[PDB]
Structures are given as C-alpha cells and as structure tokens.
Amino acid sequence: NPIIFIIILLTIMLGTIIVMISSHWLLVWIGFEMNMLAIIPIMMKNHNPRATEASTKYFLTQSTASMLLMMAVIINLMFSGQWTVMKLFNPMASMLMTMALAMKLGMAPFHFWVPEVTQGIPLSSGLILLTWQKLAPMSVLYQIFPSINLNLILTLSVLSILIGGWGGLNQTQLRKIMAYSSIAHMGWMTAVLPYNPTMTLLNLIIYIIMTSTMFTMFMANSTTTTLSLSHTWNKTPIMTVLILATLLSMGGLPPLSGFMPKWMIIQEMTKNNSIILPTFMAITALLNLYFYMRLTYSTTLTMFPSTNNMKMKWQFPLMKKMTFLPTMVVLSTMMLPLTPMLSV
Amino acid sequence: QPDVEWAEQYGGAVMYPTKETAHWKPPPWNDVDPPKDTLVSNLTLN
Amino acid sequence: XXXXXXXXXXXXXXXXXXXXXXXXXXXXXXXXXXXXXXXXXXXXXXXXXXXXXXXXXXXXXXXXXXXXXXXXXXXXXXXXXXXXXXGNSYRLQAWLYASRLLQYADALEHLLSTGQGVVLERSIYSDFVFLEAMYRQGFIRKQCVDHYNQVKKVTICEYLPPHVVVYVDVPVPEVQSRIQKKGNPHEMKITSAYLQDIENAYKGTFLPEMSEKCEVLQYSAWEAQDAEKVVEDIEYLKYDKGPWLDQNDRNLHKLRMLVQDKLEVLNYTSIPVFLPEVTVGAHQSDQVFQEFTELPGRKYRAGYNEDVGDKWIW
Amino acid sequence: XXXXXXXXXXXXXXXXXXXXXXXXXXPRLAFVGFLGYCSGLIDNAIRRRPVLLAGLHRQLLYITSFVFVGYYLLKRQDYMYAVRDHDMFSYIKSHXXXXXXXXXXXXXXXXXXX
Amino acid sequence: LLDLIWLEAILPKTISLAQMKASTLVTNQKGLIKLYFLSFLITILISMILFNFH
Amino acid sequence: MLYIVFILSVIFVMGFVGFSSKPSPIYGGLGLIVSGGVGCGIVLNFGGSFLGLMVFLIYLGGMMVVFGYTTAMATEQYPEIWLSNKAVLGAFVTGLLMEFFMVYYVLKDKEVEVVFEFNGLGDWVIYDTGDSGFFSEEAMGIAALYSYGTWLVIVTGWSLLIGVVVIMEIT
Amino acid sequence: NLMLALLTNFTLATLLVIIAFWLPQLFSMKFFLVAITFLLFDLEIALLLPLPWASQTANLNTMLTMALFLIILLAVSLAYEWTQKGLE
Amino acid sequence: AKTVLRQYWDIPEGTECHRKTYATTSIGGAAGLVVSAYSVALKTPTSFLEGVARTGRYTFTAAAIGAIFGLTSCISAQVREKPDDPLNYLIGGCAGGLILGARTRSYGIGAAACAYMGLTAALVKMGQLEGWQVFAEP
Amino acid sequence: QKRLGVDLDRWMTIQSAEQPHKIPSRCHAFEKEWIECAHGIGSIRAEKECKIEFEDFRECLLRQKTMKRLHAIRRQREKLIKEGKYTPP
Amino acid sequence: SMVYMNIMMAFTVSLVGLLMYRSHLMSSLLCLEGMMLSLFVMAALTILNSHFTLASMMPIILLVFAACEAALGLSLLVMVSNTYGTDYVQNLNLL
C-alpha cells in the first residue's frame, strides 16, 4: 500500500460528498457504493484469517441492506413519480427505507455484524473509518425525516440502547467495547430525528470527535482490557490521564463535553409532551457508563500488569488530531451552550 | 494495589465467564494466522 | 505521513552485495565472534553480539543503565551459578530474546535505507537453541516454555526475510576445555550437559533453516579463522529459492515501517499473560519508573532534555 | 428555523446578511483561546517533552487555530440566534390572533396551612 | 438487619438483577452469523403484525 | 392468447424458487438463465429495444458467466441431485405454493392480496400506452445520452477504475 | 413473430439429441483476474454503447469532452494492468 | 396490532369483564411470540420435535401473565367501590409476577421481583391521565 | 440535500423538465399541477391545500380509479350470459 | 395495477432469498442479481407506460451499477476459497 492507499482513502471522502450534495435517489445509491468498494481493501490490508471473515461479514450484511434502499427508490417511481430526496411520500416505501437505514444506523435489530467486524480489523487506522462511515447515511435521514412513521423509528432507538447497554458487559476485547458503544450512542441519533432535526447532526460532531480521539489513544497497540491495563506503570503514565478524560466524557457526566448532546435530546423531546420515553433513555444511559467505568480501572487502579519487558525508547505514532481534538472532548460545556445553532 | 491475579479476571477470553460458549479461544496479539495447510498446492498430470 | 512518491524508495540502491550474514549457534564459547570481525571485508557494517545490556547500548544516550535501571535481576554471571526458585532463570532469557529482536530491527532498517551489508553476531533464529539446552536439565519449568512459543509465533512472522547468508560452526565435544582457557573467570565452571545439548539442538536448527532455502556453509575448527576462504565462498554462492526475494513495492515498504520505530517492533514482544518468572509486581515497577525518570540520561526523553543538551525552546 | 426559507443554502459564514457586528475580545472567545493554550499543554504529555508550560514554542499555532476557527464559529452563533428571533417577531406581527394580552388581576388563590 | 442489609437492598437489588440481564446479551449467542440473521426474520414481523404501522 | 406478459411473469417467479431454497450453486445458477431469459420478455413487450437486450448482454452474457468461474474456483463438490436433500424440497414446495395459490384467485377477476392495491383483470390496460410519438419514438427509444447527465458519466468511470485497482490488490 | 422464430430452432435442436440417445440398441487462481477484468471493461463498453444511436439530437461540444473521457479512464484501468499483472 | 391494544382501554369504563379476559390473552400471547421467535436463533436440536418444545414453554407462560392480570383487575374492581386507581392495578400486578415462581422450583425470582413487576404494571395505568405520554409530536 | 449545490448545476431529476427531445411526458398535464402547487414552503409541509391536485396526479401513473371503473363494466358484460347484451363492434 | 402485482411478489421471494442461508454462500450473490432483475422490470414498466423520455436512461445506469456490486462483492467470494477449503457461511471465526 504505497501512494494509491491515499487515493483509496480519498474515494471514501469523495463518496460521502456525493451523498451530501444530492437531489437524485440513484445518486446516493452510487454514493453508498463508493464506500462499499473502498473500505473492504483497508479492512483486509495485511490479509488475515480473521480479516477474511470480517470483510465478508461486512459485505453481506451491508450490500443486501443497500439493495433494500433501491426498492424504496423504485417505489418512489411507482408512487409519487418524482426522483427527489425531499420526501418519502408512501408509507409502503418508508417501511423498507427505514429498515435499510436501520441496517447502518438504527442497529436495534441489525447490530449482529458490528462486534465481529470491528474486532476483525488488524489495524488501528481501520477503526476510525467505521466511526466515520456513519456520517454518510445520517445525511439521508436528515433529508427525509418527515412522512416516515415514528412508531417504527423510535423502536429502533429504544431497543438499541438496551442491547447496547447489555452487549458490552460480557466483553473484554477493546474493539468490541467500542463496537457496542456505537449502538448505545446510535439510540440517541435515531431519537432526535422525529423531534427537531437540529442537534442530531451535532450529536455526530460530539460522537465522531470523541471516537476518533479514542482509537488514536490506542495507537500504542492494545486489543484487550489486559493489554490496555499495562500502560500506567510500564508505558507512559501521563497518556492514561487523557484516556481517563475521554472515557468519562463517553458516558453522561456534566463537567465534560459528552453531556452537552444529552441536554438537547431530552429538552426537545420534553417540549413535545413526551416524558415516559426520555425517562427510559436516562436509565439505559447508566448501563453505557459501566463499560467505560471498568475501562477507567485500567487507568486509576494498580491492577498489577508490570511485566519483565520494559520500554525506554520514545513512541512515535501517526496522531493526526490526537492533541487538538481531546481538548474539545474533555471540556466544551461552557464553550458550547449556544453552538447548537451554529451547526444547523 | 492490584496484582496479577486481578488481571487474570479481566484477561482476554469472555470478560464474563461463559455459560454455554467457552470453546472459543482467545485471539492472537497481532492478527491471527489461520490454516497454513489444507490446500492443494501444485498440480500433477500423467 | 509516509512518503513514497519522493526520490527515496525501496529496492533502489540496494540488493547488490548488501544481503545480511549471520554467524550463530557455535557453542557457549565465543568462536564465531572472532571470525565475524574479519568477515566484514566485503560487508560495510558489522554489529556487536547482544548480551544483557544490549538494548541500552545505544537507545537514548551513549552510556548503559546500571544494574536495576535496565532490568530487575539480570546478569550473565548470575546464570553461570543458576539457582532454582526466586531468581533469574527465565526472565534473563526473555530479556535476551527481546534485545536480539530489537537490534535485528535496527540492522534491517540499516539494510533497507542505504544498501549496506550488515553482519549480525547471533541472530533471533538462534535463541531457541539456547533455551532448549537448559530445558533438558532441571532449571526452566514447562509453563515458561509455552510463554516463549507464544512470542516466537507472533514476532518472527512479521519480518519477511530470515537470513540470506548463514554460518554454523560445529566444534568438538571437548569445548569446555576451550571455555576454561578463556580470560573470563565467571564464565568458567559451566555444565557440560548444557553445552552438549546446545550442539545437539543446533543440529536440529540448521536443517529447518536449510529447508526454508537459506544458504548455509559449515566450517570446522581446522577450517575456522580464515578471511580469504569465508569471503570467496559467500561471493560465489548465489541466492536461490529463498524468501528474501520478495515484492519491491508492496512487501519492502510494509517491512520498513515496522523496523523504523523501536517501540512498534517491541509492541508485540511484551505479553499480556502472567508468569512467575517474569516479574509481575506493580510495587517494584513504580519505584523503577521513578528512578529511570530521575536518571540524567533520558529523563524527559525524545531529543530535547534539560541539563544534557538543550539547544532551543521552540 | 432549521430549514432555509429566506437564507441562502450552503454559506461560508452568512454573506446574505452581514450587518450584526461580531464580538470584540469577548469572554466567550477567551475560553476557546484558553483551550487552544490547554491543547498546547497536553500535547507534551503524549510525546514526552520537558515541561508542559516551558517547552516547545509551537504552542502559538494551537492558540491561533482555536481563535481563528472559534471567531467564525461564534459569528454563526450570533447570526443563527438573530434569524431565530427575527422569524419569531415576524410571526406575531403578521398573525396577531395567535397572541393574547392580559394585565392586572384580582384572583383568589388557595392558602396553605402549617 | 436494616442499616447494613435491608436499607442497602435497593441498589444491590438493581445490580444482582442487572448482571443477570447483562449475561443474557454478552454470553448469549455463541458467535455464528446464522443465529443473528434468524433473529432479523422476527424483527420485520414485529413491525408489521405486532406493531400497527402500515 | 389474451395475455402476453402475465404468462411470462409466472415463469419469472418459477425460476426464482431455487434461491429461497438451496439447490447448490450449479442448479441454483441455472435458475438465473431461466428467469433472466424469460424476464427479457416482460421488459420487451412494453417497449425498450436497447434496454431489453442489455439483460442478455450483461446479466446473462457477462454476470452469470463470471459466476460460472467461481463455482469451479470455490465449492464445486461434484454436482448433486436437489431432491434427495432434506428441507430443500420443503422450501421449494412452500415457495411455489405462495404464488400458485394466488394464480387460482386470478379467475373471477379479483384476487386477494397482502398489499392494499387491487389487481383486477388488466389485459388491454396492461400496457396502458397510446401511440403518441412516431418519429424517434418511445422514451426508451432514446434511452441513454451523454448530454444533460454529464455528472453521472464521471462517477461511473471513477467507480469502474476502483474495481480494477482494488481486486488486483486483494489477491 | 419473434416467439415463433426462436422456439422452432430450440425444438429442432432437442430432437437431434434424442436421435443419438434413443435409436441404437444392443485450482489455479490466476485465471480469476482475467475473468473479473472482462466484466469491468464490458460495463465501460455498456456506457459507450449508445454513441452511434445517441448522438443525433444532443449538442456535440457537450458530448465530445464526455465521450472520450470514458475511453481515457478505460486505458488508465489498462495502465494499472501493466504494473505487474503476473505470469498470465 | 395497535387496534388490539386500543380495545383494552374501552372495556374498564363499565363493569363487564367477560370479554375483557378474552382480549388480555391476545396481548400476552403475541408479545410472547416475539421472544419465542428470537429463541430460535439459539440453535434448536433436531427438527420439529424440540422446535415446538422451546416455543411451547415461552408462549404459554407469557399468555398466562396477561390472562391473570385481566382477571385480578376485575375482582379488585367488583369488590369495594372506586373505578380506576394505581393502587387497584398494583394488587393485580403482584399476581402476574407470582406465577413466574411456578415455572421453576425455587419459590423466589418471580416472588423476589414481585414488587418490581407490580410497580411496573402499575405504571401502565398511571398513564391513564393526561400527565403521561409515551410518544408525542409537538 | 444536506449540502446544496452552488453555481454549477447537475440535476435533471424531477418530472416535467427540459426533455432530451421535443417529446413530452405521458403525465405532463398533471405533472405541472403538482409543481405549481408545491412551489411555496407552506403547501407541502401543511399538505392540505394540494390534496385535490395530487390525487389527480396519482390517477395518471397508477390508473387505479380507471381500473376499478373498467372492472365494473367488464364484469357486468360477463354477467349478461343468456340475457340481453349490447353488441355493435 | 395488474402486472405490478406479480413482480412485487417476485421481489419478496428474492428478498427472503438474501435473508436465508443454508451452508452455501453463493446463493446470496445469485439473489443479489435476482433482486436487481426484479427492480429492473419494476423501473422499466413505470417509465414505459407513463412516458418520461429523459428518465428512461435511469434504468440503463441502474443496469451498470447492479453488476458493480455483483463483481466487487463476487471477487471477495474467491478470497474465502483461498484462505479456506470451500465457501461456507457455517465457516466463520469472528465473534
């Protein structure tokens, strides 16, 4: 992977632009497929028996998913006629459309591939791309948020934090914990879509920055809880303070930036006379915190992972924005109260 | 202080001891190598 | 970001008389060490043999760390009078394997960037011979061997070429008499069973090395100490069927990135698995980290350091 | 308002309406500027360098980048809150029937005991 | 009885039952793409029959 | 005699049953030739000279021919009878009975449907198209043009550059 | 009729098989890369198929820059086939 | 179906409960079939002989919870006055969680979480007033 | 669209547009009604004023209202077996 | 209306075919072709009966992209048979 690897990475960047700037329903289908043909090579890279299994599981669960989207595109020719990504019109078309989006974002009945795909990547650079790919179908949902029946969108949000809040408890694999942290945060994504379109995109701004900081802290190789355990005493001790700060912000805690999306999600929902649904969102949010709480015990507690082998030489990773973005990820509570309006 | 016995509880296996699925072994440190053999390798003709 | 579009590229200005040579597995007595120094007539660079203080030989700044600062309970003289239960035994050998792997990465980095022939004294494909000889006698437990094999499968496979030129020396069974005649008094009075097993394990190490189609030349004690004979034999013999002949664009670029950084190469070397002869105690690790930070060598680390260099603030 | 009706879609800042006047040396800008300095303190924690405060002088790049982006980000904040209020006041003026006024009363309220 | 056991038994009550609910998601379904896709068959039927929407 | 397209639509579903059922990639592969070739007639009857023959050129004479290689490259297992296998015959019989039960309801015009839309008869109303255009006729008569849709040409060319580069890098 | 013309050829073809059947009584994955490139090129041919039938009403200056563009990238895909294809 | 759920709210306005008990079985039965459908993904041994066995234990018990809940609510309504109360459904909620201890010989679990199940069942009829809304638009 | 196109235009997506030839769409008479109704923001968001014009547009593509009408005539013609039935064509 | 009633039923059979798996992996990619074949008939008839002229090019573009997923995803199938013996959905390592 020499110069052309950047070009392969550029087509994912350009692929989302096609989805972003679009008016035609077949144009976004092209935009989704621009990502399909360009993530798989980075999913493989070194060629491993675990990588072959992950890439096939990533393909089959996602290519069939986009094929359900094309049905809803063709129902938009049978009914309502026009090829515009403004409204879905038909309730018959929306049922197949929302489920196709749930296969990438809703996750509540389509989570199954995520913990196996995220674990299957041999490299840390591939972990960023799956948290960046979720930006693409969110642009579609922001365009067609009316007309779609709320009874079978909010079920994809309520159930997702339940399975996300239980699915990380029996996991020691560091990639797997972050895989279920996606599904847990995706419930908050598919909740603001029926109740006020703004702050839904800001939820991405908080999430993507917070997740990109997380994996770049794991540039010093760690794949399990026990491998991230040997970091405070043997490796760099000051580095684990930033891992602590990012993990505390991942769960809902006020002096950190991660509580600031959770503000407006409940605020806009309570304005629409709904109290019984946002209550369930807050109790299930506690279950999300528990995974980060156990993972902060690799940074706070002793835990005895000393080992005979010791590193003396200074570490030099990639670190693209692993210094500027964690400062925004640790503290942005006072910095961003009126910034909800600035995004959209 | 936490010792080596405490680290073995949070060691790479299942986080939570397995109820039914315990046959699944831990993955390798830097991407697992699968089957070296189980291949044809070079054809023979009469 | 890695630059490959620039003038600096793999395979260019290399390969033509730049292949690595290794003189490894030649009993307890250093007989291969003397012949390797004279073998650097055709080769550009020659590397020293790795010991306990081999990783800290260069590392940060000139001088090596003193006793406890480098590794807790690690001495070559201590292994001569080896004691069972609470001591060195295995953790010295695990440090010895990690040190040889680290210097191999830098020698390969010296080979890939600017094509120069580097000769290494005792490679990473020779440490298993040194371990198995001690395993035959009651010194190392069975569980520690499984810890060694787990590191063996991960670290070796990441590096593409083993060695192009291999020199294996098989001496007389009366090699202990030559070791007694040597200047070192601490190295003397070593077990004869361990030295005999080291020659036996080396016989089952040269054959798998030849099975991977690597060029190997055998030399006796009478054939030893020759500069003209060794140089002419390596030059005449052509490299064929070996795994060194790989892809110039894809394979050579990937191996160069792993060898460039010292921390990246030793990242898989540290195992998450706990062992009694591996020092797991965090209480001793906290005191050792405090002393290393207080040391005038690295302290703040990476280029800029107070009361050692200090050129500019920006 | 979320959807554009009068405002132009996809803008660098605003450009359609420029008259608002951005804040000069604001307390809000100082906090973003503090985070720019704070990012230039924890960068030496990642790459081990002597002194977080008195180390490398590439910190000026980190402070300026947070100020420059932050000034544009706060300019949109003042713009979007103005449009939100502008459409709100226009809704009352045009309809009139939706809004009701009530002033001066003498209503009885239940008193609490103990 | 009270100040250490019964008055405490409000949050350990929502830990002992919470960990039982936690084990029914993590250790449940021992791998297999087969099993996860069998569950997706039901999810479409819930949205069509069990929940009245189109 | 009365219907033209309606008979071909039944054979279209008939070939598709060997996909929900699992008759191995050999016999399952044969289904796409049967369903594809008859499937062209469904497209051709309402019009489309170019687009009707594109199925023969790409879907039939390109797509499945590459799939002919992969069956020999991976999982050949010497082709077997798709009747002796358990649950395969059960999936095949239940697959046809979901559609053939609806065929019986076509008689007496109206048929019961899961969807809200009614079927009725529609024989002369099946085409639902007048003469209208004469010279350079049909919407599919000039189906593809490089003009107007200039952006679509660039991205299709870009995506086909990706395929050649990527698949070469995997192997 | 097209249906009557096609079916007559196949029914006579089936009859020739029965004559011989009834009357008398007493590995390598390098091939795959060639097959894939066939499919990927033919799709570029599929986009370049309309040219003689399309260019009749549309403007020539708008088409000229776009028509050649597909063939240029079709040569760039073959230019990637020169940087070590294999022994095939 | 939501039309089945809407029928549940109309009956308790009067006094009749003979048709209310028949309607409660369809609510608990259909909800039990959802959990029964996901249990197929656990890989059932053999075919049909053990496949029905797993579906049988889940659906029959879940329908029993709803059926007793419908019965106990009407007994509590006929005895004494008061049409609808959260205290009235709390007694009925306890009886629904009581039969979970009959599933396995352990006496607890269902009886241990009887107050937990009874409170959650009461919360459903807490939202009969305008104060509680599960899903809202404005 | 989440991000709109500025200056350069690449659309030709919606019904009733500048066609490839001079030939017009089959439903072009009903296509113009839906565009002229929903050109304002407070028409499709409300979706009450354009209810009449959309149903006539729905009648063009699906032809469901005409299909049910022709169904009644064809059934009654079949119902008149061994009875008085009209024949002229 | 009448013709659309059968091909929508043909679409649901091809949809279930994607969601069904028994040992073989090749069926899914065969069903992906069938799904795009059923969508091709549905798209063509709507433009052919209700004339558009400009929009008749859209299924021709759809025909091209149908093969793109059925080749680049099909290429991954061969890579499974290089690592493993034969292609099986039953043969997976990821958890």
Curated annotation (Swiss-Prot), chain A:
It comes from the Eukaryota. Keywords: Electron transport, Formylation, Membrane, Mitochondrion, Mitochondrion inner membrane, NAD, Respiratory chain, Translocase, Transmembrane, Transmembrane helix, Transport, Ubiquinone. The keyword Transcription regulation does not apply. Core subunit of respiratory chain NADH dehydrogenase (Complex I) which is composed of 45 different subunits. Interacts with TMEM242. This is NADH-ubiquinone oxidoreductase chain 2. Its EC number is 7.1.1.2. InterPro entries: Complex_I_Subunit_2, NADH_DH_su2_C, NADH_UbQ_OxRdtase_chain2, ND/Mrp_TM. Belongs to the complex I subunit 2 family. GO terms for cellular component: mitochondrial inner membrane; respiratory chain complex I. It is found in: Mitochondrion inner membrane. PANTHER family: NADH-UBIQUINONE OXIDOREDUCTASE CHAIN 2. GO terms for molecular function: NADH dehydrogenase (ubiquinone) activity. Coiled coil: none annotated. Core subunit of the mitochondrial membrane respiratory chain NADH dehydrogenase (Complex I) which catalyzes electron transfer from NADH through the respiratory chain, using ubiquinone as an electron acceptor. Essential for the catalytic activity and assembly of complex I. It catalyses: a ubiquinone + NADH + 5 H(+)(in) = a ubiquinol + NAD(+) + 4 H(+)(out). It is a multi-pass membrane protein. GO terms for biological process: mitochondrial electron transport, NADH to ubiquinone; mitochondrial respiratory chain complex I assembly. The gene is MT-ND2. The keyword Cytoplasm does not apply. The chain crosses the membrane at residues 2-22, 24-44, 66-86, 95-115, 121-141, 144-164, 177-197, 199-219, 238-258, 273-293, 324-344.
Swiss-Prot record, chain B:
The modification N6-acetyllysine is found at residue 25. Belongs to the complex I 49 kDa subunit family. It comes from Bos taurus (Bovine). It comes from the Eukaryota. Core subunit of respiratory chain NADH dehydrogenase (Complex I) which is composed of 45 different subunits. Component of the iron-sulfur (IP) fragment of the enzyme. Interacts with NDUFAF3. Interacts with NDUFAF7. Interacts with CERS2. It is found in: Mitochondrion inner membrane. Core subunit of the mitochondrial membrane respiratory chain NADH dehydrogenase (Complex I) which catalyzes electron transfer from NADH through the respiratory chain, using ubiquinone as an electron acceptor. Essential for the catalytic activity and assembly of complex I. Redox-sensitive, critical component of the oxygen-sensing pathway in the pulmonary vasculature which plays a key role in acute pulmonary oxygen-sensing and hypoxic pulmonary vasoconstriction. Plays an important role in carotid body sensing of hypoxia. This is NADH dehydrogenase [ubiquinone] iron-sulfur protein 2, mitochondrial.
From Swiss-Prot, chain E:
The chain crosses the membrane at residues 31-51. It is found in: Mitochondrion inner membrane. It comes from the Eukaryota. Core subunit of the mitochondrial membrane respiratory chain NADH dehydrogenase (Complex I) which catalyzes electron transfer from NADH through the respiratory chain, using ubiquinone as an electron acceptor. Essential for the catalytic activity and assembly of complex I. Belongs to the complex I subunit 5 family. Core subunit of respiratory chain NADH dehydrogenase (Complex I) which is composed of 45 different subunits. This is NADH-ubiquinone oxidoreductase chain 5. It comes from Bos taurus (Bovine). The chain holds residues 552 to 605 of 606 of the full protein.
From Swiss-Prot, chain J:
GO terms for molecular function: NADH dehydrogenase (ubiquinone) activity. The keyword Translocase applies. GO terms for cellular component: mitochondrial inner membrane; respiratory chain complex I. Changing residue 64 to A: In strain: 66. Keywords: Electron transport, Formylation, Membrane, Mitochondrion, Mitochondrion inner membrane, NAD, Respiratory chain, Translocase, Transmembrane, Transmembrane helix, Transport, Ubiquinone. It is a multi-pass membrane protein. It is found in: Mitochondrion inner membrane. The chain crosses the membrane at residues 1-20, 28-48, 60-80. It catalyses: a ubiquinone + NADH + 5 H(+)(in) = a ubiquinol + NAD(+) + 4 H(+)(out). GO terms for biological process: ATP synthesis coupled electron transport. It holds the Pfam family Oxidored_q2. Its EC number is 7.1.1.2. Its main location: mitochondrion. Belongs to the complex I subunit 4L family. Core subunit of the mitochondrial membrane respiratory chain NADH dehydrogenase (Complex I) which catalyzes electron transfer from NADH through the respiratory chain, using ubiquinone as an electron acceptor. Part of the enzyme membrane arm which is embedded in the lipid bilayer and involved in proton translocation. Core subunit of respiratory chain NADH dehydrogenase (Complex I) which is composed of 45 different subunits. This is NADH-ubiquinone oxidoreductase chain 4L. The gene is MT-ND4L.
